[PDB]
mmCIF file of C-alpha atoms and ligand atoms in Angstrom:
data_model
loop_
_atom_site.group_PDB
_atom_site.id
_atom_site.type_symbol
_atom_site.label_atom_id
_atom_site.label_comp_id
_atom_site.label_asym_id
_atom_site.label_seq_id
_atom_site.Cartn_x
_atom_site.Cartn_y
_atom_site.Cartn_z
ATOM 1 C CA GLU A 1 -2.945 16.234 -11.881
ATOM 2 C CA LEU A 2 -2.151 14.530 -8.585
ATOM 3 C CA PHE A 3 -2.801 17.009 -5.753
ATOM 4 C CA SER A 4 -5.433 19.364 -7.234
ATOM 5 C CA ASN A 5 -9.134 19.608 -6.301
ATOM 6 C CA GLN A 6 -9.716 16.000 -7.378
ATOM 7 C CA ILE A 7 -9.769 12.906 -5.135
ATOM 8 C CA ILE A 8 -7.244 10.384 -6.491
ATOM 9 C CA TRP A 9 -6.683 6.803 -5.263
ATOM 10 C CA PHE A 10 -3.820 4.497 -6.051
ATOM 11 C CA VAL A 11 -4.861 0.850 -5.773
ATOM 12 C CA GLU A 12 -2.251 -1.882 -5.255
ATOM 13 C CA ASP A 13 -3.238 -5.552 -5.357
ATOM 14 C CA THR A 14 0.160 -7.309 -5.352
ATOM 15 C CA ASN A 15 -0.204 -8.611 -1.778
ATOM 16 C CA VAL A 16 -3.878 -9.720 -1.912
ATOM 17 C CA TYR A 17 -3.207 -13.367 -2.739
ATOM 18 C CA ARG A 18 -0.204 -14.623 -0.819
ATOM 19 C CA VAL A 19 1.034 -18.139 -0.137
ATOM 20 C CA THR A 20 3.772 -19.982 1.685
ATOM 21 C CA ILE A 21 5.271 -23.000 -0.093
ATOM 22 C CA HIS A 22 6.890 -25.964 1.599
ATOM 23 C CA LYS A 23 8.695 -29.088 0.474
ATOM 24 C CA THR A 24 7.237 -31.908 2.619
ATOM 25 C CA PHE A 25 9.139 -34.904 3.977
ATOM 26 C CA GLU A 26 7.643 -36.899 1.092
ATOM 27 C CA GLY A 27 9.149 -34.491 -1.469
ATOM 28 C CA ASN A 28 5.942 -32.772 -2.604
ATOM 29 C CA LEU A 29 5.016 -29.101 -2.554
ATOM 30 C CA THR A 30 2.312 -27.766 -0.248
ATOM 31 C CA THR A 31 0.969 -24.308 -1.016
ATOM 32 C CA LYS A 32 -1.045 -22.675 1.756
ATOM 33 C CA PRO A 33 -2.612 -19.241 1.395
ATOM 34 C CA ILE A 34 -1.830 -16.637 4.048
ATOM 35 C CA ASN A 35 -3.672 -13.380 4.746
ATOM 36 C CA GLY A 36 -3.210 -10.552 2.247
ATOM 37 C CA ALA A 37 -4.172 -6.906 1.893
ATOM 38 C CA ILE A 38 -5.344 -4.338 -0.612
ATOM 39 C CA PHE A 39 -3.756 -0.907 -0.368
ATOM 40 C CA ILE A 40 -5.926 2.056 -1.392
ATOM 41 C CA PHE A 41 -4.022 5.326 -1.040
ATOM 42 C CA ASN A 42 -4.873 9.025 -1.369
ATOM 43 C CA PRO A 43 -1.616 10.833 -2.288
ATOM 44 C CA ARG A 44 -2.938 14.265 -1.313
ATOM 45 C CA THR A 45 -4.045 13.552 2.260
ATOM 46 C CA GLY A 46 -1.908 10.495 3.029
ATOM 47 C CA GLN A 47 -4.997 8.404 3.801
ATOM 48 C CA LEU A 48 -4.547 4.655 3.438
ATOM 49 C CA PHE A 49 -7.478 2.275 3.433
ATOM 50 C CA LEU A 50 -6.028 -1.148 4.237
ATOM 51 C CA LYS A 51 -8.425 -3.951 3.366
ATOM 52 C CA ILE A 52 -7.222 -7.110 5.040
ATOM 53 C CA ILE A 53 -8.001 -10.183 2.977
ATOM 54 C CA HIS A 54 -8.500 -13.251 5.150
ATOM 55 C CA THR A 55 -7.681 -16.672 3.687
ATOM 56 C CA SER A 56 -11.262 -17.930 4.138
ATOM 57 C CA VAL A 57 -12.284 -15.970 1.025
ATOM 58 C CA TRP A 58 -10.238 -18.284 -1.222
ATOM 59 C CA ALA A 59 -11.767 -21.581 -0.325
ATOM 60 C CA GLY A 60 -13.605 -22.554 -3.523
ATOM 61 C CA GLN A 61 -11.586 -21.984 -6.693
ATOM 62 C CA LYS A 62 -8.487 -22.512 -8.865
ATOM 63 C CA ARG A 63 -6.436 -19.682 -10.450
ATOM 64 C CA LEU A 64 -6.609 -17.698 -7.228
ATOM 65 C CA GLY A 65 -4.011 -15.323 -8.718
ATOM 66 C CA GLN A 66 -6.525 -14.193 -11.329
ATOM 67 C CA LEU A 67 -9.452 -14.312 -8.928
ATOM 68 C CA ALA A 68 -7.581 -11.928 -6.591
ATOM 69 C CA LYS A 69 -7.694 -9.105 -9.170
ATOM 70 C CA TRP A 70 -11.475 -9.509 -9.256
ATOM 71 C CA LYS A 71 -11.707 -9.683 -5.479
ATOM 72 C CA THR A 72 -9.641 -6.481 -5.323
ATOM 73 C CA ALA A 73 -12.037 -4.719 -7.710
ATOM 74 C CA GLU A 74 -15.049 -5.988 -5.764
ATOM 75 C CA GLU A 75 -13.620 -4.529 -2.556
ATOM 76 C CA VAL A 76 -12.745 -1.182 -4.175
ATOM 77 C CA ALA A 77 -16.357 -0.887 -5.340
ATOM 78 C CA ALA A 78 -17.641 -1.874 -1.878
ATOM 79 C CA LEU A 79 -15.536 0.872 -0.317
ATOM 80 C CA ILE A 80 -16.843 3.407 -2.827
ATOM 81 C CA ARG A 81 -20.445 2.312 -2.093
ATOM 82 C CA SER A 82 -19.822 2.783 1.672
ATOM 83 C CA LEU A 83 -18.683 6.403 1.165
ATOM 84 C CA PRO A 84 -20.788 9.522 0.543
ATOM 85 C CA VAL A 85 -20.515 10.696 -3.094
ATOM 86 C CA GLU A 86 -18.371 13.667 -2.139
ATOM 87 C CA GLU A 87 -15.736 11.295 -0.692
ATOM 88 C CA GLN A 88 -15.649 8.985 -3.742
ATOM 89 C CA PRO A 89 -12.555 9.179 -5.936
ATOM 90 C CA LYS A 90 -12.603 10.978 -9.268
ATOM 91 C CA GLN A 91 -9.666 8.900 -10.516
ATOM 92 C CA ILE A 92 -8.350 5.441 -9.673
ATOM 93 C CA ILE A 93 -4.770 4.682 -10.717
ATOM 94 C CA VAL A 94 -3.371 1.148 -10.816
ATOM 95 C CA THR A 95 0.280 0.350 -11.462
ATOM 96 C CA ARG A 96 -0.779 -3.226 -12.189
ATOM 97 C CA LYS A 97 -2.416 -3.491 -15.640
ATOM 98 C CA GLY A 98 -4.266 -6.677 -14.599
ATOM 99 C CA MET A 99 -6.573 -4.551 -12.457
ATOM 100 C CA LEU A 100 -7.900 -2.425 -15.351
ATOM 101 C CA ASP A 101 -10.644 -4.676 -16.733
ATOM 102 C CA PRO A 102 -11.878 -5.967 -13.377
ATOM 103 C CA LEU A 103 -12.195 -2.394 -12.112
ATOM 104 C CA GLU A 104 -13.907 -1.264 -15.309
ATOM 105 C CA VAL A 105 -16.532 -3.995 -14.895
ATOM 106 C CA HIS A 106 -17.032 -3.397 -11.139
ATOM 107 C CA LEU A 107 -17.396 0.385 -11.392
ATOM 108 C CA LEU A 108 -19.951 0.636 -14.206
ATOM 109 C CA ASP A 109 -22.396 2.355 -11.809
ATOM 110 C CA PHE A 110 -19.852 5.155 -11.244
ATOM 111 C CA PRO A 111 -19.533 6.964 -14.580
ATOM 112 C CA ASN A 112 -17.690 9.920 -13.013
ATOM 113 C CA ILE A 113 -14.765 7.668 -11.977
ATOM 114 C CA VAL A 114 -11.795 7.541 -14.381
ATOM 115 C CA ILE A 115 -9.599 4.434 -14.213
ATOM 116 C CA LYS A 116 -6.056 4.539 -15.569
ATOM 117 C CA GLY A 117 -2.902 2.488 -15.587
ATOM 118 C CA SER A 118 0.546 3.664 -14.591
ATOM 119 C CA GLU A 119 4.147 2.681 -15.275
ATOM 120 C CA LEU A 120 5.209 4.126 -11.918
ATOM 121 C CA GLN A 121 6.995 2.058 -9.295
ATOM 122 C CA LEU A 122 4.839 2.536 -6.238
ATOM 123 C CA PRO A 123 5.207 -0.534 -4.033
ATOM 124 C CA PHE A 124 2.521 0.319 -1.436
ATOM 125 C CA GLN A 125 2.483 -3.388 -0.651
ATOM 126 C CA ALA A 126 5.977 -2.901 0.872
ATOM 127 C CA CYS A 127 4.037 -1.590 3.910
ATOM 128 C CA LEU A 128 3.974 -5.312 4.930
ATOM 129 C CA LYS A 129 7.644 -4.987 5.847
ATOM 130 C CA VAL A 130 6.756 -2.440 8.564
ATOM 131 C CA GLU A 131 5.991 -4.519 11.677
ATOM 132 C CA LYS A 132 2.764 -2.611 12.480
ATOM 133 C CA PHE A 133 1.134 -3.649 9.193
ATOM 134 C CA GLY A 134 2.804 -7.080 8.945
ATOM 135 C CA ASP A 135 1.559 -8.404 12.281
ATOM 136 C CA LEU A 136 -1.877 -6.870 11.778
ATOM 137 C CA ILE A 137 -2.290 -8.729 8.479
ATOM 138 C CA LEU A 138 -0.705 -11.977 9.724
ATOM 139 C CA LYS A 139 -2.875 -12.235 12.863
ATOM 140 C CA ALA A 140 -6.265 -11.270 11.400
ATOM 141 C CA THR A 141 -8.968 -13.917 11.709
ATOM 142 C CA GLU A 142 -11.524 -12.226 9.441
ATOM 143 C CA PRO A 143 -11.692 -9.498 6.777
ATOM 144 C CA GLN A 144 -11.666 -5.911 7.987
ATOM 145 C CA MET A 145 -10.717 -2.454 6.836
ATOM 146 C CA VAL A 146 -8.257 -0.324 8.785
ATOM 147 C CA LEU A 147 -7.528 3.374 8.226
ATOM 148 C CA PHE A 148 -4.050 4.911 8.440
ATOM 149 C CA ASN A 149 -2.362 8.239 7.769
ATOM 150 C CA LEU A 150 0.892 7.392 5.968
ATOM 151 C CA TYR A 151 2.274 10.945 6.216
ATOM 152 C CA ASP A 152 2.186 11.101 10.014
ATOM 153 C CA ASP A 153 2.517 14.839 10.908
ATOM 154 C CA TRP A 154 4.554 15.863 7.825
ATOM 155 C CA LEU A 155 1.812 17.921 6.228
ATOM 156 C CA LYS A 156 2.072 20.465 9.067
ATOM 157 C CA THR A 157 5.375 21.619 7.492
ATOM 158 C CA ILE A 158 5.661 20.139 3.955
ATOM 159 C CA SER A 159 3.406 19.941 0.911
ATOM 160 C CA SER A 160 1.533 16.884 -0.277
ATOM 161 C CA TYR A 161 3.912 16.688 -3.230
ATOM 162 C CA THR A 162 6.929 16.593 -0.880
ATOM 163 C CA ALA A 163 5.263 14.108 1.432
ATOM 164 C CA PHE A 164 4.361 11.758 -1.466
ATOM 165 C CA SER A 165 7.937 11.902 -2.764
ATOM 166 C CA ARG A 166 9.281 11.017 0.686
ATOM 167 C CA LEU A 167 6.822 8.141 1.095
ATOM 168 C CA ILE A 168 7.648 6.648 -2.293
ATOM 169 C CA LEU A 169 11.384 6.752 -1.573
ATOM 170 C CA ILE A 170 10.706 4.991 1.744
ATOM 171 C CA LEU A 171 8.513 2.280 0.211
ATOM 172 C CA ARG A 172 10.831 1.696 -2.723
ATOM 173 C CA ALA A 173 13.840 1.465 -0.406
ATOM 174 C CA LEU A 174 12.026 -1.065 1.814
ATOM 175 C CA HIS A 175 11.054 -2.982 -1.325
ATOM 176 C CA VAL A 176 14.564 -3.204 -2.756
ATOM 177 C CA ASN A 177 16.625 -3.547 0.462
ATOM 178 C CA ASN A 178 14.515 -3.842 3.613
ATOM 179 C CA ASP A 179 17.364 -4.318 6.086
ATOM 180 C CA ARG A 180 19.418 -1.352 4.876
ATOM 181 C CA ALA A 181 16.375 0.939 4.544
ATOM 182 C CA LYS A 182 15.496 0.289 8.175
ATOM 183 C CA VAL A 183 19.026 1.293 9.245
ATOM 184 C CA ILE A 184 18.919 4.517 7.189
ATOM 185 C CA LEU A 185 15.570 5.324 8.827
ATOM 186 C CA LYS A 186 17.105 4.983 12.313
ATOM 187 C CA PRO A 187 20.049 7.441 12.292
ATOM 188 C CA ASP A 188 20.371 7.723 16.101
ATOM 189 C CA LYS A 189 20.061 5.421 19.124
ATOM 190 C CA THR A 190 17.293 7.748 20.373
ATOM 191 C CA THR A 191 15.328 7.664 17.063
ATOM 192 C CA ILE A 192 11.732 6.710 17.871
ATOM 193 C CA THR A 193 8.495 6.226 15.988
ATOM 194 C CA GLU A 194 5.522 7.504 17.991
ATOM 195 C CA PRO A 195 2.914 4.800 18.811
ATOM 196 C CA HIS A 196 0.362 6.511 16.512
ATOM 197 C CA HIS A 197 2.866 7.177 13.699
ATOM 198 C CA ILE A 198 4.158 4.881 10.949
ATOM 199 C CA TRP A 199 7.563 6.534 10.365
ATOM 200 C CA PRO A 200 10.245 7.825 12.687
ATOM 201 C CA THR A 201 10.355 11.279 14.205
ATOM 202 C CA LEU A 202 13.286 12.992 12.483
ATOM 203 C CA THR A 203 14.479 16.586 12.251
ATOM 204 C CA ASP A 204 14.455 18.374 8.899
ATOM 205 C CA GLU A 205 18.234 17.871 8.509
ATOM 206 C CA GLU A 206 17.865 14.158 9.244
ATOM 207 C CA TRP A 207 15.158 13.827 6.595
ATOM 208 C CA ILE A 208 17.356 15.495 4.014
ATOM 209 C CA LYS A 209 20.108 12.946 4.676
ATOM 210 C CA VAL A 210 17.608 10.060 4.780
ATOM 211 C CA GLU A 211 16.030 11.083 1.457
ATOM 212 C CA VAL A 212 19.414 11.159 -0.281
ATOM 213 C CA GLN A 213 20.399 7.787 1.202
ATOM 214 C CA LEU A 214 17.134 6.087 0.221
ATOM 215 C CA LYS A 215 17.458 7.422 -3.292
ATOM 216 C CA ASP A 216 21.009 6.027 -3.510
ATOM 217 C CA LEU A 217 19.844 2.668 -2.165
ATOM 218 C CA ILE A 218 17.170 2.533 -4.879
ATOM 219 C CA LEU A 219 19.754 3.380 -7.553
ATOM 220 C CA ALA A 220 22.128 0.706 -6.263
ATOM 221 C CA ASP A 221 19.519 -2.052 -6.754
HETATM 222 CL CL1 CL B 301 -0.880 -7.218 -13.331
HETATM 223 CL CL1 CL B 302 10.868 -0.171 -6.367
#
């Protein structure tokens, strides 16, 4: 299913429409949008397309929470249209059911694309908690798309299946307990993340220990 000769994308829209809320000195609530992002992820290759959503897009309308699902689908279709046919996904998987109808309507010109929902817990949006992504999104002054490889150099020595499993444990651990996940991921004073990598450089033994610890963190909360 997931890693065969078939391009698959996971699409995550949770962090597209984001706001900060503040109680003013007068006792009222101000709600100000902040920049968001769509995560579009290929589990076989590790490719992430990060579409930064700048707050200027929101200016007109109410129910921005609903509108964001539509905006997400619009941007997925725009990405597909910008790619040669051979690079277009065969399947698009969303773990948020709210994305199903908007995607169906936006992708009517792509009859080969299958859209399905998922009950999986795949918090790709947790990438915001990694400083590289967080600052990038925060500081953007306009929409843009940025490419990343979320598996770093792992595929040189492990399968796509193994790499995906490691990534999901990392994201889920960051989602549930950010502070503790970051400690687990830095087992030594000398632990570094290369400038061009997302995740730390760890030995195989260190990864084994990390993977068990992240799993236990996820079970604990
Ligand atoms: Cl939803
Ligand atoms: Cl989770």
